[PDB]
Scaffold this active site. Structure first.
Site, PDB file in Angstrom:
ATOM      1  N   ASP A  86      44.678  49.169  45.818  1.00  0.00           N
ATOM      2  CA  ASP A  86      45.342  47.821  45.777  1.00  0.00           C
ATOM      3  C   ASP A  86      46.073  47.621  47.098  1.00  0.00           C
ATOM      4  O   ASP A  86      46.222  48.582  47.846  1.00  0.00           O
ATOM      5  CB  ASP A  86      46.309  47.580  44.600  1.00  0.00           C
ATOM      6  N   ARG A 108      38.129  32.488  37.015  1.00  0.00           N
ATOM      7  CA  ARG A 108      37.459  33.363  37.965  1.00  0.00           C
ATOM      8  C   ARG A 108      36.443  34.281  37.286  1.00  0.00           C
ATOM      9  O   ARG A 108      35.610  34.879  37.975  1.00  0.00           O
ATOM     10  CB  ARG A 108      38.457  34.202  38.710  1.00  0.00           C
ATOM     11  N   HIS A 111      53.156  36.449  38.335  1.00  0.00           N
ATOM     12  CA  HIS A 111      52.836  37.077  39.606  1.00  0.00           C
ATOM     13  C   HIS A 111      53.691  38.315  39.954  1.00  0.00           C
ATOM     14  O   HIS A 111      54.882  38.202  40.108  1.00  0.00           O
ATOM     15  CB  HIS A 111      52.923  35.980  40.691  1.00  0.00           C
ATOM     16  N   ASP A 141      38.217  37.072  50.789  1.00  0.00           N
ATOM     17  CA  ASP A 141      38.109  36.687  49.388  1.00  0.00           C
ATOM     18  C   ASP A 141      37.486  35.292  49.256  1.00  0.00           C
ATOM     19  O   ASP A 141      38.206  34.287  49.231  1.00  0.00           O
ATOM     20  CB  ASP A 141      39.498  36.693  48.717  1.00  0.00           C
ATOM     21  N   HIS A 172      37.920  43.587  38.482  1.00  0.00           N
ATOM     22  CA  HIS A 172      38.853  44.590  38.982  1.00  0.00           C
ATOM     23  C   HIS A 172      38.724  45.779  38.054  1.00  0.00           C
ATOM     24  O   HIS A 172      39.101  45.706  36.897  1.00  0.00           O
ATOM     25  CB  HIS A 172      40.280  44.047  38.976  1.00  0.00           C
TER      26      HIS A 172
HETATM   27  C1  LIG Z   1      53.752  32.398  36.186  1.00  0.00           C
HETATM   28  C2  LIG Z   1      54.779  32.341  37.242  1.00  0.00           C
HETATM   29  O1  LIG Z   1      54.481  31.919  38.365  1.00  0.00           O
HETATM   30  N1  LIG Z   1      55.998  32.761  36.901  1.00  0.00           N
HETATM   31  C3  LIG Z   1      56.439  33.087  35.544  1.00  0.00           C
HETATM   32  C4  LIG Z   1      57.027  31.959  34.651  1.00  0.00           C
HETATM   33  O2  LIG Z   1      56.045  31.004  34.307  1.00  0.00           O
HETATM   34  C5  LIG Z   1      57.511  32.563  33.339  1.00  0.00           C
HETATM   35  O3  LIG Z   1      58.098  31.624  32.447  1.00  0.00           O
HETATM   36  C6  LIG Z   1      58.442  33.744  33.616  1.00  0.00           C
HETATM   37  C7  LIG Z   1      59.022  34.372  32.349  1.00  0.00           C
HETATM   38  O4  LIG Z   1      58.028  34.938  31.542  1.00  0.00           O
HETATM   39  O5  LIG Z   1      57.694  34.688  34.336  1.00  0.00           O
HETATM   40  C8  LIG Z   1      57.364  34.271  35.623  1.00  0.00           C
HETATM   41  O6  LIG Z   1      56.611  35.319  36.198  1.00  0.00           O
HETATM   42  C1  LIG Z   2      43.701  38.201  42.064  1.00  0.00           C
HETATM   43  C2  LIG Z   2      43.703  39.582  41.559  1.00  0.00           C
HETATM   44  O1  LIG Z   2      43.844  39.810  40.345  1.00  0.00           O
HETATM   45  N1  LIG Z   2      43.592  40.522  42.504  1.00  0.00           N
HETATM   46  C3  LIG Z   2      43.446  40.343  43.928  1.00  0.00           C
HETATM   47  C4  LIG Z   2      41.995  40.589  44.269  1.00  0.00           C
HETATM   48  O2  LIG Z   2      41.208  39.624  43.609  1.00  0.00           O
HETATM   49  C5  LIG Z   2      41.777  40.555  45.780  1.00  0.00           C
HETATM   50  O3  LIG Z   2      40.425  40.744  46.114  1.00  0.00           O
HETATM   51  C6  LIG Z   2      42.635  41.590  46.482  1.00  0.00           C
HETATM   52  C7  LIG Z   2      42.557  41.430  48.003  1.00  0.00           C
HETATM   53  O4  LIG Z   2      43.067  40.188  48.460  1.00  0.00           O
HETATM   54  O5  LIG Z   2      43.982  41.397  46.105  1.00  0.00           O
HETATM   55  C8  LIG Z   2      44.351  41.281  44.739  1.00  0.00           C
HETATM   56  O6  LIG Z   2      45.663  40.755  44.822  1.00  0.00           O
END
Ligand SMILES: CC(=O)N[C@@H]1[C@@H](O)[C@H](O)[C@@H](CO)O[C@H]1O
Ligand SMILES: CC(=O)N[C@@H]1[C@@H](O)[C@H](O)[C@@H](CO)O[C@H]1O
Lengths: 339, 334
Positions: A256, A142, A185, A67, A173
């Protein structure tokens, strides 16, 4: 040096050099390629040794990917030109116009690809074709631009740059990650729009890139309920009916990262949905589990699809080009965009 | 109107108005608050109805939170001032200097909080204190700046602005999400000293200056602990409570079995667990749930209650000073 067709699994490795266990794993006929990460990178000379020993295991040589998008997605930093985020190219588009932006995109692609090609890498998973709807933080900068025409044209210019550096492209994607919110995340977001809305915008860059020779696609981990209740990467509708049939795409569809319900089952549903190659990252245990007694699904197109992604430049040719003034100037220009 | 202490679970809801099932769920003593998302928002008047009916279910009233950070993290758009991403403030810092940037941050905080306070929201989960190391896409432009001093100072200024609008702050994501790559459970290989020298400093400073809550990073820092921060006694009790002196809420990761995951969260030092987009898992968790002993919980929830009354908010929103703040903030976002 055993001759084994490239299998439909893309695996990865733990650190800077192959262990004996890893060597045995990568000989498995289920495996066709490897994705590298920052943990696999010490410096350029170590990387070259790593890629060489991966390639030496078998023929056709395992395809190696990484990547390198730019900005906050660039695995290998030390000894590489620092790459700008793709939105920097869209800002040049807005400010200095399309022509200046395309030229800049071509140089970024060239530098990006050439430096990686020198280290034995086949492909970078780029470009992002997602549109900047101002909703999705994880995509964020991005994305090239909000406007599908700007995205398509900058992507095509980047793609020509990549090819100068020996590489094909991988659009991300599919069918478009830009509209959902994504800032927590590991959530699985929902895009409530209609197919027509996507055809009018988010899909257009994918169609155009497909037409112009894009080698691969990574699917969005996103559900589009008006089209299908399943996430795109596990949807026959998205992958077979829309991407294959309607769009005419002939390249690789990656899955994925599948990393329970069981890895074998998760892979099975991916292949059944239309993925050519499944990614299994950070989990050599799950790769071991998957490959044990693994039946390779019948896919007469796989070998050609992998082969289309092979780097087109020889290693010596690349070391030569990197000594040229033309390439060194490109490097400095791209470095400047990143600062 | 039943009187039930606020439980240690923050849950959420499906759409624009409570269903009867949701009403029953939110009456469960395991629940203490609710987080809202874009799917819960139609317009300001609907939102006010929603927050009112949530608050009417019980006393002390369920605490209501939302993610209004700015830029690509702003749940509620129509009828609200569009907020700039936090890195915009760091760009002002670089271009026009600290004083202009702090002033701008204060105004952003004030507008952000006040407009939410008018709709019955208690708290926005902001600010992000993660440093922009140029590594982490999921943070991305949500970070103020690369430099810990810039982050700390912009965060403090935003915090003062939030308090003017009736709200406390919630720092994210402790002890620092900025260095890892994130685009899985990321790994930050640095030493504690390296973190103390940079990523932790904004958290210490915000803690000292009255920050109400923290959200932990879903990140492993192997030189300190083999467990992710949100499940680590070392990070949460030894470092955050004992060493830093933080007395506010420690929220968990979104835990989305669940009972075990919650148990280990509480045991690690979290006060309140978040369970989002999965009312089934909330139902599973609450069934036969024993509330862990936490004599501080009631005060920790209560510190986060909005400090402005409805009439006070309406009054301030009519002032020319506030209306000007609105237009200034709108201008940063365009
Ligand atoms: C973005 C991150 O790393 N973690 C988030 C945080 O910021 C957020 O307040 C919470 C509740 O919505 O959800 C998590 O996934
Ligand atoms: C960041 C995102 O939205 N998706 C990533 C993608 O960009 C990446 O190419 C693939 C392989 O590492 O994995 C996903 O987690």
């Amino acid at each position: 040096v055993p001759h084994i067709p490239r299998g439909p699994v893309m695996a990865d490795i733990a650190a800077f050099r192959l262990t004996e266990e890893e060597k045995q794993r990568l000989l498995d006929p289920a495996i066709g390629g490897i994705i590298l990460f920052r943990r696999n990178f010490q410096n350029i000379e170590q990387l070259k040794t790593l890629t060489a020993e991966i390639k030496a295991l078998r023929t056709p040589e395992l395809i190696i990917a990484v990547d390198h998008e730019g900005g906050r997605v660039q695995r290998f930093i030390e000894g590489f030109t620092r790459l700008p985020a793709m939105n920097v190219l869209g800002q040049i588009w807005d400010k200095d116009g399309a022509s200046a932006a395309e030229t800049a995109a071509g140089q970024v692609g060239r530098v990006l690809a050439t430096e990686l090609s020198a280290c034995g890498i086949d492909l970078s998973f780029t470009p992002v074709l997602d549109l900047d709807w101002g909703n999705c933080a994880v995509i964020g900068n991005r994305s090239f631009h909000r406007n599908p025409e700007a995205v398509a044209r900058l992507a095509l210019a980047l793609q020509k740059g990549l090819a100068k550096g020996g590489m094909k492209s991988c659009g991300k994607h599919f069918p478009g990650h830009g509209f959902v919110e994504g800032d927590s995340h590991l959530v699985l977001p929902e895009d409530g729009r209609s197919l027509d809305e996507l055809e009018a915008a988010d899909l257009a860059p994918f169609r155009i890139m497909s037409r112009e020779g894009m080698a691969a696609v990574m699917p969005a981990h996103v559900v589009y309920p008006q089209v299908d209740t399943k996430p795109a990467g596990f949807s026959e509708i998205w992958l077979k009916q829309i991407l294959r049939r309607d769009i005419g795409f002939k390249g690789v569809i990656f899955s994925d990262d599948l990393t329970a319900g069981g890895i074998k089952e998760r892979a099975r549903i991916s292949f059944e949905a239309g993925c050519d190659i499944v990614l299994v990252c950070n989990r050599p245990d799950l790769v071991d589990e998957l490959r044990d007694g693994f039946t390779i699904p019948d896919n007469q197109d796989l070998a050609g699809r992998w082969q289309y992604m092979e780097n087109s430049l020889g290693h010596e040719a690349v070391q030569a080009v990197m000594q040229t003034m033309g390439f060194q100037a490109a490097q400095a220009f791209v470095a400047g965009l990143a600062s």
